[PDB]
Structure formats: C-alpha cells, structure tokens
C-alpha cells in the first residue's frame, strides 16, 4: 500500500526531494553564487516539471534571494513590476474592449466572406487574421478571441465525420502557430520580446538600435516566409494538397459551397450593423497603432522630436495606457431612473478578468530571478566557465544555442525560457567577443518556436481545450513548423539581419 | 434638452473640466513643481468626486509623469510593487485557506456559544472577534469574512421586526467599525499602517524604532480603549442601555433565549467536526503570528540573530510569503480514477479571486504619485511654504494635521488619504524641528478613523451593502465613534506614547 501513497502523493514528494537534494549545493560552498544556482535550479525544476503553478514559482524567488542574503526584500519587490506590466494593462485594456462588443466577430466575418469557402484558402485566412491580430495582440489574449469564432465557423460550414474532424484538427493548428507567428513580428506582439527589449535596453542602455520600425523591418520577412510556409506545410499534412481546383477560380460553385458562403452571409447579417461601440473601439485601436509606428523610426520621430527634453521617458506603454484608460472614459451604454449615469465602455471588474495577474506575476518573478542572477555575481561566473568556448566557430555557437532554447522551450512557457536563457546567453556573448544582439536575436526568436506540446504556450493549451486535436498529430505539425521556423531564422540571420545590424563585427556599445 | 444631456453624462464633462481647467498650471510655470502638482491634483480629484475607478486613477501618474517629464516610466512602473505587495499577497493565501474551509464560521459560533445571546454581550463578542481577526488579516478581508456569519447568526436569533431591525443595524455597524479598530492595532493589520511603516523606513533609514512588537506596545491600549468606548457608544445608541439584567448572571434563562441558545448549538452540530485542512490552516495561521512576533521585538531578536550578517533582508512579508505559498503545497483532498493527484488546499483559479489587485494597483499609484512628489521637488517647496507655521505650538499643529485627515479620509479611502498626506507632513514635520513621528503617527492613527460614509473604506460598503443600513444613523455611529478615537488619539500622544518614542525632543535620526 506504500506504492500506492507515493504514486498518488507524486507533486509534494516531488516538491520536498527538489528542495532537499539540491540543499547540500548551498548548505556547502559558502558563495553567493551557489545560493543563486540553488534558487535557479529550484526555480527551473518547478517551471519544466510543473510541479507548482509557474506564479506559485515565480513568487519564491521573492522567498528565497532576501533569506540567502543575496537582495533586500524590497529590491525583489521593485522588480516584480516593469514597463512591460503598463504595456500589458493597456493592451488588455484594449483586447477587453474588443471582445466585450464582439469587434472580433465583424472582423473574422468578413474575413471569411471575403476569402471564400475553399478549405485551404479558408485556413490561409485565418492563419493571415489571426497572425495580424496577434501583430499588436498577445498570442495569449489572440489565440483566446479568435479560437471560438473560428471553431464556430468551420462548425457551421461543416454542417450546411472524418474529413470535417480533419478540418477541424487543421483549423486549431493553424489558428495555434499563427498566434505566435503574428507575436513575433513586433516587440509588443508577444510578452517574450518585450522581455528581450527591456533586457536588452537595461544591459546596453547605450545602444539603441532596438526601435519599432527596425524590429519589424527584420521580423516582418522572415514571418512572412515562416507563415506561408507553415500554411503549406499544414495544409499538405492534414488536408492534401490539391492545386488544380484549388488557384483556378472556381466560378461555377458547387452546391455545397453556395450554401456555406449563404450560410455564413445570413450569419453576418444576424450579427447586425456595426454599432458606435465597434467604430470607438476601431478608431482607439488604430490610434494606438499608429502612435507605436510613431515614435522614432529613424526616418521623421514625430512622437520623440515633442519630447526631445527628456529622452526615453515616455514609451510604448504610455500610448498604450493612454489609449487603454480612455476605453475606461467613453460612455457607450446610456443609464424608471435605471441608475441615472452611463457605462464607461469597460468596467474595472470585467478588466479584472480578460486580465493575465498570473503571466503578470511570472514575468515579474522571472525578472527577479535575472536580477538576482546578476547582482550575486552567478552570470559573471557562467560568462567566465563558458569563455573556452569562445575558440568554436561562432555560427555554430548560435545554431546549438538556438537548438537549446527551442528544445526547452517545448516544456517550459516562453517568458520563463527567455527569463532563464537570457542571463546566460549574454555573458556568453561578450566572452566570446562576439556581437550579443548576433545571439540574442536567433534566441529570442526561437523561443517563441514553442508547438509541439500543449503545455508549451498557453495558445497551444487554449487550442487543445478543445478536444478536437490529439497530441501525437500536434507534434508532427509542431515538428514541421519549427523546423521551418529555425531555418528560416538561420537564413536570415546569414542573409539579411547582418547588413543593418552589423552584426559580423563587435559593436562599440557592447563591453570590452 | 441641453440640460438633460449635460446632467446624464456628468462624470465624462467633469473629467474633461477638471483635466482642461487645470492644465494652464503647468502650461505657464515651466517648473516640475507645478507640473507634479497638477498631477497631483487631477488625481486626488478623481479619487475624492470618483469620476474614474480608483485604479484607473492610479494608473494616471504612470500616464503623467513620464510625459510631463518628470521620471521615467520604469521607476514608475517599478514603484507600482513594494513589499507591502508581497505581504498582501501572503495574507490574502491564508485567508483563502480560512475562508474556503469555514474555519471562520467555526470561530465564529464557538464564540457565540461561548458568549451567550444577550445582545449586548453579544455585540461586544463580534467586536471583540472581529477585531482579533483583523489584527492579523486586512480590514476589507476579515469585514468580508465576518458580515455573512454574524448576518446569519442575528438572522437565526431573531427567527427563534423593528427591535431585529435595530438589533441588525447595530451588529452590522459594530462589524464595520471593529474590523478597522482592530486592523490599527499592528502593522500588518491594515494598508494604512504599511504604507506608513514603509514610507518611515525608506525615508528615515536611519531609524528603527518601529518595529512589530513596538508598533503593538503603544497601539493596543489605545486601540482597546477605542473598542470599548465604541461598543459602548453603539449599544447606547441602538439597543439602549439596560445593566440591571446585563451584567447580573442570568442563570434563569427566559424561554426564548434557551430556543436561541439550542438553535445556535444546533447550527454548530451541522457544522461538524473539526476536519484536517482546517487545523493545518490554523496551525500555518498560529505559525504567521508568532513568526511576525519573532522578528526583532527588542527582548530576544530570535529570528533576526540567525540572519544577522545581512539586516533588513527578510521581513515580514518573507514569513507571509513562506506561509501563503505553503497554502499552496499541502494537500486537503485526494483524487474511476478522479484525476490521480491531489489538490493543494489552494488553487490558483482560488487565489486569482479573493485577491484586491484593484487594491494592489490603487496602493501602487499612490506609491508612484509620492515617488514623484518627492523627486520633481514639490514637497521641498511644500515644507519651504508651510516653514513660517512652524512658530505656531506643536500640539495645535498635531490637531489640525488629524483633523484635516479624518476629516478627508470620510471622502477618500484610506491608503488614498495616507499617500496624499504622508509627503505632505513630512517635509512640515522636519521643517517645524518637531520630531517626524509627532506628527506622522497621529495621523496615520486617524486615516483609519473613517465611518461616516460607506465609500469611506471598503468595510463600511460591504457592511451597507446588505441594506439593513441608512445613511444617517451610520453617520451618528461614525460621529460618536471618530471623536471617540480622536479623543483617545490625541490622549495617548500626550500621556503614554511620549515616553517611548522621546516625541518631546528631536531625534538624531531626522534631518537638520
Ligand atoms: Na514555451
Ligand atoms: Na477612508
């Protein structure tokens, strides 16, 4: 009967023999060092193996740097919260507003009108919608609005069972990598490139070749190219590939199509007219996109020459918490008194939900843990362990790092992968005299190249919810995919990142 | 018509007048001082009229600072989390644990077995409780908890209506008012003394006087005094004063009274027995209290001796982390086969919910408002303009900063109040050459006296919102019950707390 009581008692017998085993590392080495190591490695376990929810983990770095000695309580509390968290307030802000008066639902309708009912176009579609959604958008937060809509549509397509449960299978898929594809785009896309831009800002702040406009100008092409090919990919795997039908304009429509572009017609239309609510949203929206492409792009800063007085002080989370606390200002429903007032379009408790506290509070103890990393002197000694390497080929330094950070970041969730690769990652790349952004950037690429397992993301487990898709099929697509994704990272960073980075020579902003 | 349109849509126009008609402050001064206070300004505006949700005001100076040129938005961003953060966070897991197991209501009717039903006694036994539980536990938690229980216990008391009317009013009002009364008592117990004992250390490192055990040594007598004294004044007021049958042993007990004696026991017996996953919450619980009593109180540092070769690393919100995240781990209920694993006596989905991040964020804002304040120069220009009102006495000036205080904290909640007024006394305080914690305690003390209105503090809106209540008899019971804790205030200021903090002199410890 104690088999059974051990098998069934798995997590906390787990949870006590990480904390104990690993105890003889800092019980004895009397360094600040081993401490920090211990706090990691206890952090890591918890964040691959799951055997604590990721925030439950992300707190004890707050537990255990001010007990070792290694930063004050209230230096850990200060960097729980980041400009990241005012970005993220103002985006969700804004994802809220669109989803509480269905914006999502006219977009994908008329997506889906516009593109046809031809599967593999369908699924280029939503591939393409939800990749320029998820441009602006948390892949999160994306994933979540367009998941139900598209399931909803290819629902009611099917109906007006194996073939429609491989289109469904295909469906999630597509709606799953596009997210992340559509993420990687623009430093605001996703949480994992904010985390790289701020660690970048802070450990250089003297460099600034991080800008908007040149994150999308080196990002844009190889997603472009990661997603057509991911789309091909998809479509050959699940659907077949049937190209005779498929370019030729079929103007003569079957039956069955006729019906399901009439059916997807009397469905936008009970959707109604677009109503003021949509149109304010709309407009707040592209408003916020506009003022990100705003600030410097290197051709006419016209945000930044305004407050040329005190530079870097205002960002992309201010336009973002403009914009997102003006969604909590404009009436939109009015009020036998019925309470008098309006209603401000959002209300604090429908943000409260729609709101990521616990991704908010896993970035914040992620960035704990780097501080901590750094101020201990931990990095300084994994820079210093891993100079030898530095006499390898470069290429191959940022191929097997790639390798590294792709592979773990199956298991583990994007911004604890970036979290954790980061501090190691940078020390490595000036001890090898080796330009930092010349790894950071296939790195912190790749992290986002997470599709195999549901576990990887939460886009993928928000697909998966579903029930439609089977694990063994996710990791043959997922395989595909990032295979596609890291070689046309590799080519890129061969090719075209090299000519405006200058990344073939050390930059001068990087430490001697 | 006109006049309609302008009377529905007051809270939008008045948010535009105040924005407009104060920004000529800062569009001709071209000083920081002017540009904080406008800041400043707009946002106390909107958290005393509450045009906008507290936290959407708290969130403007992240939005203003940064803009107006003052900070940048990571210090912003960064002062939004401080240790107060952490150690809400941890005594918010432990009253999810209470709360979830009805250890509460355990409590709760073993003191009314414990008291009897004669309603005075019975309305000092919830005071009494409710107090003890908020020494501990946040005033808006421990009302939360304790409103639902003793509602249900008068409820049933009367079944076994203007005498239950009053006798509810009076239970709900003793409720509201005991939860703060006993939150003044510790540090820990409410936001107001944190962000007081947090605002003490980061300006005055130097001093170390406030620490847990004397925090407790010159608030609990007062605090008691203040307790009875209300508890007095509040049956006097509603149920009326009759000692002749109170305080002599009624062992001949009326008909009615024995029925409600055995209902109450026949409530306890459905309740059952004790179960497992409530004594591990009582001993985690009983574990938090004597841990923050272990901390430095004077006569033996136990828990500071151990790790004094770094100080001031691990404080309290270290134990209350420590506890809440072992909330996290413990199984309660284990599991045809039901999902293998247990649960941890907490789930996250749990924590996510009967957590304030509305509260977390107002805190934030306050703290970033006075971080600003402090750096753009206002409160030097403050304390230099409020210099000449030094050669008035001191204890006129204690007065006035107390009455000012509890006068505006009626209007404004507390924490609101407090990071309004703490930048605002202190530059007074060290500009008069009067000791800082003369004036800084008295009013710190009176922020938390606030019962006139139910949007005064959340306690006094959870307590209304069941109804019983009316907004005139609740502004006598704060009337009697706010000069009644002034009156204690300013009497222990003058007798007993002088000779332990030496208020007379000044200290060495506050600057020149
Ligand atoms: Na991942
Ligand atoms: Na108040």
């Known amino acids: 009967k104690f088999f059974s009581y051990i098998l069934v008692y798995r997590r906390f017998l787990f949870v006590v023999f990480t904390v104990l085993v690993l105890l003889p590392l800092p019980i004895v080495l009397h360094t600040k060092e081993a401490e920090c190591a211990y706090t990691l490695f206890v952090v890591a376990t918890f964040w691959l193996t799951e055997a604590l929810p990721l925030s439950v983990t992300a707190l004890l770095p707050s537990l255990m740097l001010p007990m070792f000695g290694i930063m004050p309580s209230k230096k850990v509390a200060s960097a729980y919260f980041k400009d990241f968290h005012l970005l993220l307030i103002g985006v969700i802000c804004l994802a809220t507003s669109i989803e509480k008066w269905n914006l999502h639902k006219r977009i994908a309708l008329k997506m889906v009108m516009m593109v046809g009912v031809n599967p593999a176009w369908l699924t280029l579609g939503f591939m393409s919608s939800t990749a320029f959604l998820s441009m602006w958008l948390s892949n999160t937060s994306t994933a979540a609005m367009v998941m139900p809509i598209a399931e909803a549509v290819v629902q009611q397509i099917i109906n007006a069972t194996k073939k429609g449960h491989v289109t469904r299978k295909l469906t999630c898929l597509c709606i799953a990598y596009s997210s992340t594809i559509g993420g990687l785009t623009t430093i605001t896309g996703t949480s994992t490139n904010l985390i790289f831009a701020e660690y970048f800002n802070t450990r250089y702040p003297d460099c600034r070749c991080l800008n908007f406009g040149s994150w999308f100008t080196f990002s844009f092409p190889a997603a472009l190219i990661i997603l057509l090919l991911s789309w091909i990919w998809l479509q050959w795997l699940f659907l077949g590939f049937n190209f005779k039908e498929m370019f030729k304009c079929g103007k003569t429509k079957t039956v069955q199509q006729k019906a399901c572009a009439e059916v997807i017609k009397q469905e936008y239309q009970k959707l109604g007219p677009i109503r003021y609510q949509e149109i304010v949203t709309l407009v707040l929206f592209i408003i916020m996109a506009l003022l990100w492409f705003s600030r410097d792009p290197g051709f006419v800063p016209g945000w930044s020459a305004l407050f040329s007085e005190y530079p870097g002080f205002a960002t992309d989370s201010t336009v973002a918490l ?39 509070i896993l970035v914040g103890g992620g960035f704990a843990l780097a501080d901590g990393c750094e101020e201990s002197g931990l990095s300084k000694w994994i820079g210093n362990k891993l100079s030898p390497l530095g006499s390898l080929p470069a290429w191959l330094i940022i191929l097997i790092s790639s390798l590294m950070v792709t592979s773990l970041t199956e298991v583990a969730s994007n911004p604890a992968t970036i979290t954790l690769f980061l501090p ?89």
Chains 1, 2 share one sequence.
Do not use: R
């Not at 019925?338 to 943000?351: G, H, N």
């Not at 599709?451 to 697509?477: E, Q, T």
């Open 322 to 360: 403009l914009i997102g606390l003006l969604f909590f200002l404009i009436p939109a429903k009015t009020l036998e008194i019925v309470a008098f007032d309006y209603s401000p379009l959002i209300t604090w408790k429908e943000f409260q939900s729609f709101m990521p506290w616990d991704i908010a």
């Open 424 to 512: 190691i990652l940078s020390p490595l790349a000036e001890a090898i005299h080796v330009n930092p952004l010349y790894i950071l950037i296939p790195s912190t690429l790749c992290t986002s190249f997470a599709f195999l397992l549901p576990v990887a993301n939460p886009p993928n487990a928000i697909v998966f919810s579903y029930g439609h898709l089977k694990v063994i099929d996710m990791v043959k697509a997922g395989l595909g995919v990032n295979i596609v994704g890291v070689a046309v990272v590799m080519l890129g960073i061969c090719t075209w990142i090299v000519p405006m980075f200058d990344l073939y020579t050390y930059p001068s902003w990087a430490p001697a």
